[PDB]
Design a protein around this ligand. Structure first.
Ligand code: UUK
Length: 216
């Protein structure tokens, strides 16, 4: 069995919470979070990678109009690299692709998908691999006002995925099982930019419906 709780923040695999601003770039933050995890695991280095690189250059995605993490990992593969945040800083508006090989800070050898709706497999992937990119319904007012505790809302729609976040761990808070979720809505949203989302409550908010992680 994988451990009963895992928190990659404790192991230095997770960079500070970012703010996407007025740009539908959640998919780009999710993607860099998962690549930042694999980079810490494989090199021992924790550094901010470049969401802007993905926003401006993933031509299969729609920049500030939205995107998929799988598309981003395929781009980092084909492109033979992703820049550091330092070499390709975040603007929060879509600009023409300015990828600079000099600033390359990680590569990607492909990616894997979690079987759709399978929270057991998502748990094993987080334990075995590290932080995993996930998609959720974040449309509910209850989501936007989250403060503390383990978030569950029966009105959450697992067939309405509209937001990309990062599962950096999982655990059990006073008997309530959860996913530890890094958002990209700033340090002052939720609990310092994080939300605990209900785990093993019938794929709540579709947490295991579009999960993926990069190979490195
Ligand atoms: C970030 C925008 N979402 C996406 O990119 C989705 C991610 C999938 C994994 C679900 N993909 C998508 O829609 O791609 C296509 C190709 C355009 C279809 C999520 C986000 O921050 N926002 C969306 C949202 C909508 C309702 C309630 C909560 C969140 C909010 C947002 C939008 C624009 C600017 C800033 C924030």
């Amino acid at each position: 069995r994988a451990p009963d709780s895992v928190d990659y923040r404790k192991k230095g695999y997770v960079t500070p919470v970012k703010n996407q601003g007025q740009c539908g770039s959640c998919w780009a933050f999710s993607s860099v979070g998962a690549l930042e995890g694999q980079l810490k695991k494989k090199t021992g280095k924790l550094l901010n990678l470049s969401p802007q690189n993905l926003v401006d250059c993933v031509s299969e995605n729609d920049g500030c109009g939205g995107g998929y993490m799988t598309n981003a990992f395929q781009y980092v593969q084909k492109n033979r690299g992703i820049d550091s945040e330092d070499a390709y800083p975040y603007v929060g508006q879509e600009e023409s692709c300015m990828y600079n090989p000099t600033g390359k800070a990680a590569k990607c050898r492909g990616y894997r998908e979690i079987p759709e709706g399978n929270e057991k497999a998502l748990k094993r992937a987080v334990a075995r691999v590290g932080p995993v990119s996930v998609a959720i319904d974040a449309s509910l007012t209850s989501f936007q006002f989250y403060s503390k505790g383990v978030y569950y809302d029966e009105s959450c729609n697992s067939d309405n995925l509209n937001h990309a976040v990062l599962a950096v761990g999982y655990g059990i808070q006073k008997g309530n099982k959860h996913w530890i979720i890094k958002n990209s809505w700033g340090e002052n949203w939720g609990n310092k930019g994080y939300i605990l989302m209900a785990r093993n409550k019938n794929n709540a908010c579709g947490i295991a419906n579009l999960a993926s992680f990069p190979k490195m």
